[PDB]
């Protein structure tokens, strides 16, 4: 159920079949222009998971705090790191990772072998403003926006970092610290 492929790929071996191009047009020039761009994008990132998150209300420098931690890590490790960081940007990175993995599964890739191979940011459209200063001077008041792109590939070169895991606090009927026998410590 993949979108049609309209040309040969750049791979050493071909894995799909090229289909004939459509012969019908869209009613309006605006619709035709938009759809041509969509067709061009559908020729890319085949056999890999990709995501593109638009208009995140953050800046490039704020996003790079989290992204620099996950590059070249296995998907399982990268996902865990994004959860523990107490930053507003870490929430958006986590959503992108989940969206990309869902994309990979639809293409038929094994989630247990995915590696974060490419991550970068891109500039969005800015909201301009002004703020007054002393003695009649004025300054800038800008709200920034950014795009995030994540690419997941199978059996790509990965870092060896691995995190230790411990269980949380045991609360409820599963905690049995009250059954400890303290009579032993009085002996020699």
């Amino acid at each position: 159920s993949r979108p049609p492929l309209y040309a040969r790929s750049g791979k050493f071996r071909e894995s799909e079949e090229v289909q004939p191009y459509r012969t019908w047009y869209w009613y309006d020039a605006e619709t035709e222009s938009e759809e041509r761009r969509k067709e061009l994008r559908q020729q890319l990132y085949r056999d890999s998971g990709m995501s593109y998150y638009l208009n995140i209300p953050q800046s490039m420098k704020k996003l790079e705090r989290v992204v620099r931690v996950i590059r070249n890590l296995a998907y399982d490790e990268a996902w865990k790191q994004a959860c523990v960081l107490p930053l507003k940007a870490a929430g958006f990175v986590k959503e992108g990772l989940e969206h990309a993995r869902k994309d990979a599964e639809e293409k038929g890739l094994d989630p247990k072998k995915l590696v974060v191979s490419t991550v970068y940011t891109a500039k969005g459209k800015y909201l301009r403003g002004f703020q007054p200063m002393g003695k009649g001077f004025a300054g800038r008041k800008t709200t920034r926006k950014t795009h995030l792109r994540i690419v997941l590939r199978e059996n790509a070169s990965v870092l060896p970092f691995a995190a230790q895991v411990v269980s949380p606090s045991r609360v409820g009927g599963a905690s049995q610290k009250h059954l400890r026998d303290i009579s032993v410590r009085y002996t020699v």
């Binding site: 969509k38 995501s51 593109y52 998150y53 638009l54 208009n55 995140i56 209300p57 969206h99």
Partner: peptide, 24 residues
């Protein structure tokens, strides 16, 4: 806290448009 009633519609539209979303 004192937004105009004559531009309520346009504020709503801008709020919807200016949300993060995934491309296609």
């Amino acid at each position: 806290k004192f937004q105009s009633r004559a531009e309520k519609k346009y504020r709503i539209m801008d709020e919807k448009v200016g949300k993060p979303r995934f491309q296609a």
